[PDB]
Design a binder for this molecule. Sequence first.
Ligand SMILES: COC(=O)c1cc(S(N)(=O)=O)c(Cl)cc1S(=O)(=O)c1ccccc1
Ligand SMILES: COC(=O)c1cc(S(N)(=O)=O)c(Cl)cc1S(=O)(=O)c1ccccc1
Ligand SMILES: [Zn+2]
Lengths: 260, 261
Amino acid sequence: KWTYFGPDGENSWSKKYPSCGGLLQSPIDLHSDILQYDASLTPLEFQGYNLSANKQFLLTNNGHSVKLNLPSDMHIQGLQSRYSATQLHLHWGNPNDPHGSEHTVSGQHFAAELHIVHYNSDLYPDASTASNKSEGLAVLAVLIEMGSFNPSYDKIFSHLQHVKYKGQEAFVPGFNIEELLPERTAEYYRYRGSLTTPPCNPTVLWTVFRNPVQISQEQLLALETALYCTHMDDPSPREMINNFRQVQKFDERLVYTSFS
Amino acid sequence: KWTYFGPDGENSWSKKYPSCGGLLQSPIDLHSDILQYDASLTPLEFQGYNLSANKQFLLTNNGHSVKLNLPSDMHIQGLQSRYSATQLHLHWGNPNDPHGSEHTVSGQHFAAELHIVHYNSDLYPDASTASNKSEGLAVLAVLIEMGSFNPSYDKIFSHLQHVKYKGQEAFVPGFNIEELLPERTAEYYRYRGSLTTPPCNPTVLWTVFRNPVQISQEQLLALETALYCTHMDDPSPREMINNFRQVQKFDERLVYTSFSQ
Ligand SMILES: COC(=O)c1cc(S(N)(=O)=O)c(Cl)cc1S(=O)(=O)c1ccccc1
Ligand SMILES: COC(=O)c1cc(S(N)(=O)=O)c(Cl)cc1S(=O)(=O)c1ccccc1
Ligand SMILES: [Zn+2]
């Protein structure tokens, strides 16, 4: 019902998802002129991120990213409500232009970006119900650049080949999701914005960590090449690449920073 | 009708203008991974750009773009057909954020951008007809940075008050349009793209000069406060600001450079 390329790509999302042409759209360029230090931005606490080695979590290719389902006892402490985990997923570019983060910093893309989606569980029963509702969602965003090999990210990437096609799923044994976060998580950008995918609801409190993580060149290439958007049996396969949204105008608004 | 801000802004243009959601869209970010040197990109020659100072050229505000109309004797030599001029116009930001170029370079906006629109007059009678055909249009794009006062650009900016509102027109005396071009015009980026406004037809052969020109802070402020999208008598005035489109996905394209380095 939507893609990142061709006639169903992001300029057309607004036809069937009207919020994608509304206010508060993400992502955005985090550039120096709109940043404002805010002392009220205290460190978040990541509760229940150490997932039971004994539990298994569903990894799915639904056609737009790959998603790892997360349990609802996993949550962020430190916001105005408790926000419980629902899933994580990534965005990336392609081997010929490996710069596929959604947020940019001073106009520069990172190689990729991880999102850990949470919903307001003090108010709503599930992310679905939260997603179109006031204060419904909070996302943690990690920027990713090419560098040293990252064993923790491999705990997800080593499963990519089982979810190559739309509809495929694999079980992933629990691990400590906090290993996916960067150094100095107390340092972050914060703004009110939207889902970066349809239906683009303006209901997301964004936290983009200041510091990127690194993954190896081989890991990045595997991410960029492992997946397709199409079913195994589609005679016209489409690679899952460039699954990021272009930055949105962000006018007469600030991004708050927990650092100066 | 379409705008750069709010419910009728650029993520909604495709609802009325289908090409805005199709292939070959402009503008784009120019960055190393998609550039390729092409030694066949030889210099353009600018013919009949020195418009007589004793003649007059119509400037118009249609609510979307203020355009200086140009005579069809003005043309580019060097492309695969003669491309004759039709109009030039600008894109810019706003007083509190003078960063409104359409093309970006390595992720950064310039202060503004000049587009000099031409059409294939060997094949077509007018730009409107041309605008529906592959490579029917060629635009020269000049990136504009805040810097020194520019007397040549002032030959346009000094007239905007007579066209402050939609539906207004005024006459500008001829001057040498080549004065608006940067240094070393032989160095440019070339790619296949589209109109950056509705109806977004993918029918433009873009030439973006490598080097910017400078206009001053004061000239930027004047341009960002001079003009309205709306009629003089409209009870809901809208300033003509931030009239640039976000860069578009590349869709496998490369940009060809006439410079190697
Ligand atoms: C299709 O949706 C996604 O891909 C997505 C992506 C984002 S994202 N990329 O902004 O973090 C969020 Cl917050 C949440 C989700 S989502 O939780 O998957 C979702 C899906 C349908 C309706 C509501 C929410
Ligand atoms: C509404 O159009 C413009 O504003 C515009 C803008 C561009 S641009 N801003 O891509 O140079 C060109 Cl090439 C050409 C034009 S245009 O020549 O004005 C035009 C208008 C309607 C249909 C076809 C062409
Ligand atoms: Zn233009």
